[PDB]
Amino acid sequence: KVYVELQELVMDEKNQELRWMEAARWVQLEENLGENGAWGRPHLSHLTFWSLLELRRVFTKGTVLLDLQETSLAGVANQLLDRFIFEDQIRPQDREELLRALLLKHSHAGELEALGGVKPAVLTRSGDPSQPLLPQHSSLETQLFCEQLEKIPPDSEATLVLVGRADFLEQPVLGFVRLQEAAELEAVELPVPIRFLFVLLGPEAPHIDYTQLGRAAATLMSERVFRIDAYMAQSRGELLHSLEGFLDCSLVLPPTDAPSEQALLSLVPVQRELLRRRYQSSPAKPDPLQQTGQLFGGLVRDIRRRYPYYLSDITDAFSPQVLAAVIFIYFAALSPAITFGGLLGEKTRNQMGVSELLISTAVQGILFALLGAQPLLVVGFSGPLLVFEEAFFSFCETNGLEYIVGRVWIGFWLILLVVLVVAFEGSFLVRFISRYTQEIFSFLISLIFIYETFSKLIKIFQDHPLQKTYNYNVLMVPKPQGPLPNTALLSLVLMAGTFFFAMMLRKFKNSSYFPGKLRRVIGDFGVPISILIMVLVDFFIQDTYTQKLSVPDGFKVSNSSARGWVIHPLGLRSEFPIWMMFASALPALLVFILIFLESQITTLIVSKPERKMVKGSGFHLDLLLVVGMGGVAALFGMPWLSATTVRSVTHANALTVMGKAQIQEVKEQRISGLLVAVLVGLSILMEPILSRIPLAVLFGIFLYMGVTSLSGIQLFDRILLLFKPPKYHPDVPYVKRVKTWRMHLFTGIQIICLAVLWVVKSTPASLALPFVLILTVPLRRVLLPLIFRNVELQCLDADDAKAT
Amino acid sequence: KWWSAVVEERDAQSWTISVTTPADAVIGHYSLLLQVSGRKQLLLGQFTLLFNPWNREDAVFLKNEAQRMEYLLNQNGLIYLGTADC
Ligand SMILES: CCCCCCCC(=O)OC[C@H](COP(=O)(O)O[C@@H]1[C@H](O)[C@H](O)[C@@H](OP(=O)(O)O)[C@H](OP(=O)(O)O)[C@H]1O)OC(=O)CCCCCCC
Ligand SMILES: CCCCCCCCCCCC(=O)OC[C@H](COP(=O)(O)OCC[N+](C)(C)C)OC(=O)CCCCCCCCCCC
Ligand SMILES: CC(C)CCC[C@@H](C)[C@H]1CC[C@H]2[C@@H]3CC=C4C[C@@H](O)CC[C@]4(C)[C@H]3CC[C@]12C
Ligand SMILES: *[C@@H]1O[C@H](CO)[C@@H](O)[C@H](O)[C@H]1NC(C)=O
């Protein structure tokens, strides 16, 4: 490699004195000098077409001084101008002013800031520089690489390219000089001797930018083939022949209105062939659901996919939307925690209660946020887990078995099961769960959530019926022992009000009122604003009773006389039998299928391609974390949790940034879920705050989440299309490429599946819901092609919403 | 004699339709649209409507074919200048 320096004749700003200033330099890669005074990022040299066209024109009639016995810029310029005149390239009257320009002071980057900067100058017959007349074009290299020396080998020789504009010239002129011996000149401050000198002088002319001309000449000198030819050329024609080969192997890229990487990489064979042609004459030679067949391969790839994004997973949470999402998901995960913990304490005789669920949710959420590959999932108790708890309690009480110790052994089996599943990459079976099962499960879960919220409101009405007369002296501890006036109606009013305010602020976010950023902010905090408004409304009505949030008194076991914080696997009061230590696998099996299906389907729904998640989702790490944490928590008398669908979907939706109707990005970070888990753990100490929050406001919030979670489900959209006329139907591939009655038959089969699952959930055999849900995969993969074409299935059951 | 359309030839995939316009129709640029029941309007295309010297019922009807070509189709005209005697 050699050093090439390009200097341009410019005039300064303080004394208006013309001089030479370095504009770029080359050590193979090209560096450019910005107006600030610093060198830009080094880059591969790209040339304009006009610079190479003009460089070939001046080089054809150029002036060559090969093996010239001079060791000074004054000596070179005297000989160069003497043969310029002999070649009739400049007139003898021009020699005096051109020699004055060449032997001027050559400034460098160390004096750009010391001076007032430089502006382009054109030499005149008079000494004072003329202001350029042609329209100025700012250098593309400066705009693209500059607005923000040890590589030189000891034996290397340098090349100086000088470009300048003089109005008193007929045509641009090229002077090429190869010194007999490489000498040090005052123009170059670097301690590298100069062998070659490019001099490019001429008038202002169209299609000629002398900075680009110098860049082309310096790039040509920086090329290895031409430089070897330049060292061995004893005539102008040999340099001309090398230039022609340089242009023969050049690749011109025409303008296009649709640039792309793939179209550009289609020229890789062309670039390789052109480089091969150039060096053929010179003596130089040219210098997440896949199965890998490896143990724990999915887990390692899951870690490597997401863990590099850990720094972004903290910094991306510095937005008010994340805080609003924290306030949302805190209530959305705390109220189900309290309700399920109360039901657990009522059923299990307080062996497992509210405090255990709260602490388990907090610890598991903190660990999942810190270590999970998809931190947008919310980990907490769910309905099927409660049903399993009641079933196992009934079984343990039937055969005189301790319930919590059986839970310990079930978790011990769960750890082994999840280790075996992860070690064999068993999470790749998730790829057989297409949009069919995912959307059926999501729609069923949202419908169940809405139905349960309405059932809670109905139960409030039954507990406090509307009647002509009421008992006024009723006992108020620990809950209403009788009907109360204005209670059910106020609960209805609060629920409707908070739902209405949440929906109004959601429409305000997408509305065109107020400053948009303020509207976006206000809209982000829409659910907290509605919650605060209705909490204040109930606060200012003091006479009426409304049921409030109740948290445990402290961080103590829910039943002090039954168990401690740690459970002995051999038994608490009686010896645990040997046969149940082995028989706990089957209930552990059922729990594993429940948790696996719920968590992996939730991960599939949340991490859909249409949701615009670029940080990746791990199906092996999250399952291992959730099931192992549940198995460990079983040893501490704590519930095993799962990645719930509604809470995770709401959490992802609250972090989604909408474009200007179209998903733009999601704030994928680890801080929001961590703060929700920490607040759930701290909720015991926040009793004076939570005790003034009514359950009706949270019921309206639940209704909002239920109606919101249906936005991205194509099954819900097609069910709407059932009530919607075909002409109205949207421009989507399953409408435009599938017949309307075929689409409705597809929707009706999905509806029949939903009805079957709802019926199954209504029976005591509701723990078989995972298996019946699994049965929808053989449906789509076998029976659906027996009545639907492949085109229809591709359009309707599309992974990324594609038109086949 | 008014706006009308009839299918003349038809295969399983296409209809050959003969479309009439009234002899006293408004001239100018027209849009042709097709309405199918249960469907929104569809623009078939655009056409320009002109006076018709070839049609008996038109107000610009010319009796003679030679007169029709001379006075409407011939783009190569002659303007007579000079004087009456030259
Ligand atoms: C709450 C403010 C109190 C009013 C104080 C009175 C002062 C006051 O707020 O008005 C002047 C000011 C004008 O400033 P300006 O027009 O530059 O501000 C535009 C406004 O922020 C829009 O919401 C933005 O659109 P989007 O939504 O981001 O897409 C738009 O950006 P863009 O996208 O077009 O490039 C912004 O340019 O605001 C209004 O726009 C009028 C609405 C008045 C707001 C009145 C609301 C009651
Ligand atoms: C968007 C927000 C929600 C909107 C929907 C409104 C639903 C309100 C709940 C009604 C059903 C219900 O709960 O009624 C059921 C209750 C309870 O009957 P019971 O015999 O005591 O129960 C028997 C069970 N025991 C034996 C345990 C007690 O009936 C009533 O007390 C009758 C009064 C109903 C008042 C309806 C309010 C106005 C609703 C219309 C508003 C547009
Ligand atoms: C996957 C997990 C649950 C391990 C499977 C459980 C079986 C294989 C093992 C694990 C721990 C074992 C127990 C460990 C220690 C003893 C004490 C000894 O005096 C009697 C047998 C007994 C009680 C063992 C019985 C078998 C046992 C219960
Ligand atoms: C706690 O357990 C004891 C004995 O096991 C039982 O008698 C009591 O009812 C339990 N407490 C509650 C609140 O259920």
PDB file of C-alpha atoms and ligand atoms in Angstrom, chain A residues 349-350 559 561-562, ligand 4:
ATOM      1  CA  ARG A 349     -58.240 -24.709  53.562  1.00  0.00           C
ATOM      2  CA  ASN A 350     -55.699 -21.836  53.303  1.00  0.00           C
ATOM      3  CA  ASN A 559     -52.212 -20.662  57.395  1.00  0.00           C
ATOM      4  CA  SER A 561     -50.722 -24.014  61.752  1.00  0.00           C
ATOM      5  CA  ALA A 562     -50.603 -26.101  58.574  1.00  0.00           C
TER       6      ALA A 562
HETATM    7  C1  LIG C   4     -55.574 -23.956  58.764  1.00  0.00           C
HETATM    8  O1  LIG C   4     -55.350 -25.378  58.908  1.00  0.00           O
HETATM    9  C2  LIG C   4     -56.032 -25.860  60.073  1.00  0.00           C
HETATM   10  C3  LIG C   4     -55.547 -27.256  60.378  1.00  0.00           C
HETATM   11  O2  LIG C   4     -54.863 -27.874  59.298  1.00  0.00           O
HETATM   12  C4  LIG C   4     -57.536 -25.751  59.870  1.00  0.00           C
HETATM   13  O3  LIG C   4     -58.215 -26.271  61.009  1.00  0.00           O
HETATM   14  C5  LIG C   4     -57.906 -24.290  59.651  1.00  0.00           C
HETATM   15  O4  LIG C   4     -59.288 -24.183  59.333  1.00  0.00           O
HETATM   16  C6  LIG C   4     -57.069 -23.685  58.529  1.00  0.00           C
HETATM   17  N1  LIG C   4     -57.337 -22.260  58.409  1.00  0.00           N
HETATM   18  C7  LIG C   4     -58.197 -21.747  57.524  1.00  0.00           C
HETATM   19  C8  LIG C   4     -58.376 -20.259  57.570  1.00  0.00           C
HETATM   20  O5  LIG C   4     -58.796 -22.451  56.716  1.00  0.00           O
END
